[PDB]
Amino acid sequence: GSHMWIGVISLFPEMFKAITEFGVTGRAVKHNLLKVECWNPRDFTFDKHKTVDDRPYGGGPGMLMMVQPLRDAIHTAKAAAGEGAKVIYLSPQGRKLDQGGVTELAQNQKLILVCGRYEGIDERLIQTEIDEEWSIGDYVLTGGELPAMTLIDAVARFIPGVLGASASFADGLLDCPHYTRPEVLEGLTVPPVLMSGHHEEIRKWRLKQSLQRTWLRRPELLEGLALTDEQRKLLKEAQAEHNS
Amino acid sequence: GSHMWIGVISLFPEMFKAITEFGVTGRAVKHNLLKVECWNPRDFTFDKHKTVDDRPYGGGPGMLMMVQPLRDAIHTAKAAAGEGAKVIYLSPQGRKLDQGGVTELAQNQKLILVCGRYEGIDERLIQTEIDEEWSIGDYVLTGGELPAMTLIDAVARFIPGVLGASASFADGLLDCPHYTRPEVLEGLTVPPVLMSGHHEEIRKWRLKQSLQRTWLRRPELLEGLALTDEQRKLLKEAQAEHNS
Ligand SMILES: Cc1cccc(C(=O)NCCC2(CNc3ccc(C(N)=O)cn3)CCCCC2)c1
Numbered sequence: 001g002s003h004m005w006i007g008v009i010s011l012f013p014e015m016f017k018a019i020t021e022f023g024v025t026g027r028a029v030k031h032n033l034l035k036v037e038c039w040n041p042r043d044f045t046f047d048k049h050k051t052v053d054d055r056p057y058g059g060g061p062g063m064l065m066m067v068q069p070l071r072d073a074i075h076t077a078k079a080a081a082g083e084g085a086k087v088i089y090l091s092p093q094g095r096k097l098d099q100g101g102v103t104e105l106a107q108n109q110k111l112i113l114v115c116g117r118y119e120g121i122d123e124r125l126i127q128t129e130i131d132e133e134w135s136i137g138d139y140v141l142t143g144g145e146l147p148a149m150t151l152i153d154a155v156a157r158f159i160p161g162v163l164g165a166s167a168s169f170a171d172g173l174l175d176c177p178h179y180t181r182p183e184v185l186e187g188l189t190v191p192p193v194l195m196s197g198h199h200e201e202i203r204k205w206r207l208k209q210s211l212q213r214t215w216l217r218r219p220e221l222l223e224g225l226a227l228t229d230e231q232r233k234l235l236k237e238a239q240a241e242h243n244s
Numbered sequence: 245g246s247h248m249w250i251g252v253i254s255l256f257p258e259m260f261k262a263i264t265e266f267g268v269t270g271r272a273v274k275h276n277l278l279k280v281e282c283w284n285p286r287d288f289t290f291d292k293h294k295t296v297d298d299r300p301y302g303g304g305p306g307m308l309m310m311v312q313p314l315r316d317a318i319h320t321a322k323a324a325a326g327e328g329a330k331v332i333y334l335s336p337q338g339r340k341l342d343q344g345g346v347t348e349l350a351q352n353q354k355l356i357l358v359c360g361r362y363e364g365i366d367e368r369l370i371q372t373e374i375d376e377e378w379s380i381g382d383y384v385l386t387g388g389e390l391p392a393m394t395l396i397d398a399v400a401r402f403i404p405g406v407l408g409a410s411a412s413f414a415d416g417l418l419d420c421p422h423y424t425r426p427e428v429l430e431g432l433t434v435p436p437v438l439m440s441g442h443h444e445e446i447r448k449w450r451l452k453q454s455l456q457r458t459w460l461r462r463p464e465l466l467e468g469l470a471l472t473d474e475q476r477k478l479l480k481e482a483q484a485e486h487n488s
């Protein structure tokens with residue numbers, strides 16, 4: 001159905017095996033629901049030593065991605081993608097990814113993800129080749145590959161058939177606690193409601209737990225929500241119990 | 245020197261090749277600055293079909309990590325780590341990772357990272373086995389492996405010898421623009437200051453650019469900082485120019 005194609009520009013394409021060969025995403029690739037295609041700037045070099053880095057104007061330590069091999073790799077990916085491919089640059093300077101952002105990105109049938117190494121890429125390439133800049137969080141990594149892989153995994157969950165944070169009606173809340181066998185573990189028992197077989201009591205317990213957990217751990221997330229009448233009631237109950 | 249050991253619990257240990265075999269982190273592993281050791285709950289199963297999932301109490305769709313194989317894997321990792329290993333569970337319900345959090349985690353000589361699959365792990369395991377809960381961002385992935393890999397990469401940058409977001413004195417600000425060859429690219433020129441050879445003008449330009457970029461893209465980050473006199477001045481200059 002709404003299958004997705006993701007082009008990747010990376011000096012380390014074999015890193016992407018972590019998502020293309022394993023788990024739910026691996027199955028998505030095998031079943032042709034998701035296609036990940038990689039281009040390596042090293043393949044676009046022409047000097048004997050296949051140089052992919054270059055010195056920064058203005059000095060300072062560190063190197064940057066060499067423009068020519070990276071530019072040529074991007075152009076080749078764009079040509080293969082055809083029309084409509086959104087080109088994304090992953091860096092801490094980008095729009096912070098959240099679940100709403102994931103759902104926006106998942107609307108695209110084609111994406112090209114540019115993964116930098118070293119200290120960065122030329123600002124003029126960002127101006128001329130990149131459509132959107134995204135960050136997976138406020139921290140610094142050794143390359144854009146893990147961020148790209150994270151984005152791919154997050155959007156892959158929205159492709160029909162692949163499956164069986166933020167935005168019942170619990171979208172926007174933290175997940176509730178989960179329990180499986182055994183009934184008693186290190187003296188700790190499963191909440192009896194979960195054994196009751198009472199589907200409505202269980203639903204309300206889970207929703208109440210999610211509201212309580214969000215209130216205690218991430219109260220700022222609650223402010224972004226328009227709680228339903230039921231959610232307002234269950235949250236009040238949790239707060240009263242917490243205060244008791 | 246201050247080398248780091250990271251134990252990992254994962255159903256897909258081969259995913260970790262993405263960080264142990266490539267780039268800066270790959271070199272860190274080869275040079276014994278970083279050691280990543282994996283235990284797979286599947287190896288701790290005893291039934292013919294090596295079952296690693298189990299049904300949730302209370303019903304609902306989805307499965308959870310089976311308790312016994314996961315618990316046994318964790319205990320084995322803890323025994324190997326010896327004393328002082330901090331056990332971390334990666335999920336959206338955890339403390340949000342940022343660069344300050346990375347620096348806190350990097351203080352640990354040993355970490356054990358628990359990577360879940362399916363819909364989660366038993367809440368009582370979180371109570372009894374986990375020291376800290378961390379999230380790499382407000383989005384949902386298919387497993388805890390990419391978050392674990394992200395954390396490892398982020399902390400690896402702090403191990404001496406491995407190298408040559410948030411918290412001069414530019415810590416806390418977004419990165420400045422970078423330029424490399426050629427001097428003119430698609431009609432776009434490198435800022436002349438970067439060619440001036442004037443080290444102090446270049447330093448101030450970069451700092452001003454970082455202040456401007458942080459103000460325009462992430463103004464909330466500026467509020468968390470106590471700007472130096474120089475930073476206050478350069479920010480004012482950037483704001484005046486933006487308003488002109
Ligand atoms: C605030 C600050 C201060 C100092 C340097 C930087 C900086 O941007 N350094 C360059 C890092 C680099 C790759 N590493 C990444 C990529 C993406 C993400 C993410 N959070 O999505 C994290 N780290 C280099 C290759 C191009 C992309 C960026 C940022």
Ligand SMILES: Cc1cccc(C(=O)NCCC2(CNc3ccc(C(N)=O)cn3)CCCCC2)c1
Nearest residue numbers: 165175334335360361364379380384385387391
């Ligand atoms: C808000 C919300 C709503 C609904 C479900 C969940 C949920 O937690 N679902 C389970 C996901 C799972 C793995 N996926 C991950 C792991 C870590 C991260 C991260 N951001 O660090 C992201 N995704 C399952 C295995 C155990 C760990 C958690 C969360």
